[PDB]
Design a protein around this ligand. Structure first.
Ligand code: HEM
Ligand code: HEM
Ligand code: HEM
Ligand SMILES: [Fe+2]
Ligand SMILES: [Fe+2]
Ligand SMILES: [Fe+2]
Ligand SMILES: [Fe+2]
Ligand SMILES: [Fe+2]
Ligand SMILES: [Fe+2]
Ligand SMILES: [Fe+2]
Ligand SMILES: [Fe+2]
Ligand SMILES: [Fe+2]
Ligand SMILES: [Fe+2]
Ligand SMILES: [Fe+2]
Ligand SMILES: [Fe+2]
Ligand SMILES: [Fe+2]
Ligand SMILES: [Fe+2]
Ligand SMILES: [Fe+2]
Ligand SMILES: [Mg+2]
Ligand SMILES: [Mg+2]
Ligand SMILES: [Mg+2]
Ligand SMILES: [Mg+2]
Ligand SMILES: [Mg+2]
Ligand SMILES: [Mg+2]
Ligand SMILES: [Mg+2]
Ligand SMILES: [Mg+2]
Ligand SMILES: [Mg+2]
Lengths: 155, 155, 155, 155, 155, 155, 155
């Protein structure tokens, strides 16, 4: 079904952000795992798989609207070197993506592409959950201390 | 069956206390939950459903005694900002209420409303348990330390 | 994540509404239960837990948006003395509440707080169903008569 | 297998009636359920489904006989405003059809379409059961009074 | 609950379209099955049912909104003579109604009937799925040839 | 019980028809089976066991009516050499028999042998089904092509 | 454990190749599925999930050898517009990656990094299966024909 050209661009924009979140979280995930931070690793891993599913939904939607998904452009990944940093990189990421999503949702409303809007709304709801977990981890670190926090993430 | 007017005034009195407890603990529960303090949040949550059961019992008792339950008044809520403060507020709350319960059990005895006395006695035994747990946490905080005590409340 | 101050203000207001419903429906529930009107008390009981869930969702959303939930203020409960009056009071409360829900959804739209909009929409759809049942009963009372209606509610 | 032009003409006619029954009963079913008359609702709902299986039987027989089903035209639709009237309108229709079926069975006999006859015969027996139930409901209203009948159709 | 006259007017309009879908899909389904194309028949049969659930949702909304469902008027019916055309007539219908759903959701939003909106919203997502399947069948006919496509729809 | 002499002559008549069908379909079945046309062979096989059941019914009916079943005469067998021919032969066979069945049902009616009429009516309804399937295959052959139609009959 | 700088450069290179395939196979996969070619889509999907696992194995190896996995560089994706081209694009990828794996294995052998060589041999064996499958589908297309091949890929 022929979709809106500008709507397809927003979708590709959102898709671009997702592909980045995918590699960054996967790498981070395997890093925690490599440090012996199993709990932290398993959670970062799922965050990765979620982003993969977001990418999947977007791709399918774009194909349905008769557009061309763009998996060719990979933006700058924000890799960290230590836990507190990695958390803050994922946070910067998730945040930087909110303006694009709300701008995409707002555009779909304006052109009557309500299904795409519901799609982006779901993903959005999911992005706010990640942002929440992340903030919580950072607060937890300041509350119980890096040593205790990292001990809690082993196994 | 028409009950003693003063006994019902007492019941409504204690009822207002519980209603406060309900709100205070539910907010504290969602706050812990929100800070990622799983354990604390779960306990405070139950303490809350507990107070609801207490309120429920009094309501029924009042209704039976042919009085009018007062779910209209809600006293000051002692909301803490950080864990130790929140625990102290709940303890202070559970203690300011005991005198009233005892003054009520004492009264039922004086006018022979033995059944209402058994109701309060039960609510009472629970209250000394809510207080027991609370006092325990406060002492743990001083024995293992806040950071350690918080850490252990995470999962 | 810091949310819109006006959105949180809206949310907090709706929270007060729910808290009112909880108490009103709970009293009505125990009253029906107290008159031997099992069916009615059972339903009213559920309508009450429903409102408790609503309140819980708003609280959590408010906390996430980093605001202070208000379990403190409690509005005027509309208590009835007889079945028909009790149904009216509840319908009245559920209706004098919609304008606020809609004014809030509309607001979230204006500031792009789409996730809060979804929260409100859900409880909104639930509210129209509470209103449906209520109206359904009121009309029923006039179709089969009060005596028959009450009889039906006993068992 | 080419069948008699006139036999198919009857089949087509019978079919229009079913399509009418379908919509009419479907509307009464939702109306009943909208008023809170579960018992009446479910029955009208199933009767609606019954009429759907009837139409389905005809469409197939017609297609097989190499004719063109006319799902296009829909005749008058006796919609009622109250139970009593809705029950009567459903009985008028359920009767205004009998002749057609009876008339169609006689026709099939005269031209040797025995298979079409037995098929109609079946819808015919079923229709006499839609009528028995309807006439019974109306009589019941007399024997126990409207408000009583309704009270029975609630749950 | 009294709803907006214009919103109920849209709902009523949307409802007519579904009733058409129901009949057109049901006829095609029997035709397919009559020719021996089981797969095609089974799918049209399901799409026929889907449309019935759509119409049922509207009817309830309309009744709840205190309007009068119009099961009476039935729009024209795009009947096809062969698969290729039958598939096209069904795609046209699904597209000649998509705008209405879009036009209705926009209306509900402008007058605050958020509940009706989410209801149309769903039928809408579903209809984009009916359309995706139809477009796919047509494209498949191209890529593999009518004879192969039909051969694959047999068993 | 002594039956009508003409009714029995009819029964024996139709009986001879079935016996032919039995042989024709069994040979056609083993021929398909032999050509590796699994599906066709299986269907033709059942159509054959069917005709056996028909013959069985008539035999019993004749025996009851106190007549002598004639399994002695066997008419011309229409054996095809290739698929389409075989289908046409079976169709031609199933059609030359219908007039006789109808002429027999008609006769039973005239002499009041209603039970024998029900027997024929059933055999009749099956016959229009054997014809339905056969006509379907012939049309499929012309829609997807012989090679394609044969291919699909292999497994 | 510190690994050989060049072994790591090789590992990073293979990783880059895997990362390309992931996206190419995932886009091709959703494309087949968007066209209704379920068989093909499901296969490409799995081959894509395979590359993901491959990349995962390398990421881990690299982290263990204390190097920095590079998920930032993304080579040129070869995306086709129709099945045959898409199959040829993936085959080209696999082939263009074979030299690099063999080069890497050979280097690990020259510096005593046997565990890294073992890992690579495994991925190598997996890559020859993808190739065998791709070459086979292309041959299958020549033996039976695009129309038939595509039909076979439908379900
Ligand atoms: C007049 C005050 C209230 C009364 C009498 C009341 C009573 C109850 C009762 C008896 C239950 C059943 C619990 C069980 O035994 O499993 C319940 C459940 C619950 N209450 Fe309350 N409640 C009150 C206020 C509140 C408030 C203000 C909140 C939130 C701030 C709340 C939130 C809940 C929740 C979430 C549940 C669990 C519901 C579920 O089972 O899914 N309640 N309440
Ligand atoms: C236009 C108004 C119609 C409405 C509102 C309606 C509604 C429904 C609903 C809600 C169901 C049950 C769906 C499920 O749970 O699976 C149903 C089933 C069905 N409908 Fe309709 N329908 C309509 C018209 C028709 C017509 C005109 C036909 C035939 C031409 C038809 C034939 C059927 C059949 C065969 C079933 C399945 C029955 C069974 O499984 O026992 N419907 N319909
Ligand atoms: C174009 C980007 C990618 C897309 C669209 C994608 C999509 C997916 C999807 C749909 C799944 C299934 C999710 C589930 O049901 O659990 C999956 C699984 C997985 N992905 Fe990705 N993925 C991508 C990139 C990656 C990358 C870059 C890696 C690793 C560096 C990766 C590693 C994995 C793993 C390990 C699994 C699960 C494997 C298993 O099933 O055992 N993915 N991916
Ligand atoms: Fe995401
Ligand atoms: Fe995210
Ligand atoms: Fe510790
Ligand atoms: Fe208590
Ligand atoms: Fe307590
Ligand atoms: Fe509510
Ligand atoms: Fe409510
Ligand atoms: Fe009927
Ligand atoms: Fe009927
Ligand atoms: Fe629809
Ligand atoms: Fe549709
Ligand atoms: Fe036979
Ligand atoms: Fe036969
Ligand atoms: Fe690979
Ligand atoms: Fe590969
Ligand atoms: Mg939504
Ligand atoms: Mg926070
Ligand atoms: Mg009493
Ligand atoms: Mg035919
Ligand atoms: Mg008969
Ligand atoms: Mg109503
Ligand atoms: Mg398409
Ligand atoms: Mg004998
Ligand atoms: Mg290490």
């Amino acid at each position: 079904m022929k979709g809106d050209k500008i709507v397809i661009q927003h979708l590709n924009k959102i898709l671009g952000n997702e592909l980045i979140a995918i590699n960054q979280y996967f790498l981070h995930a395997r890093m925690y795992e490599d440090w012996g931070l199993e709990k932290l690793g398993k959670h970062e891993y799922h965050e990765s798989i979620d982003e993969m599913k977001h990418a999947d939904k977007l791709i399918k939607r774009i194909l349905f609207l008769e557009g061309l998904p763009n998996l060719q452009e990979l933006g700058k990944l924000l890799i960290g070197e230590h836990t507190k940093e990695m958390l803050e990189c994922d946070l910067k990421l998730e945040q930087a993506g909110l303006p694009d999503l709300k701008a995409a949702i707002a555009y779909c409303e304006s052109v009557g592409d309500y299904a795409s809007r519901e799609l982006l709304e779901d993903i959005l709801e999911s992005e706010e959950d990640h942002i929440d977990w992340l903030e919580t981890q950072l607060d937890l670190i300041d509350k119980i201390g890096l040593e205790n926090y990292l001990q809690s993430q082993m196994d």
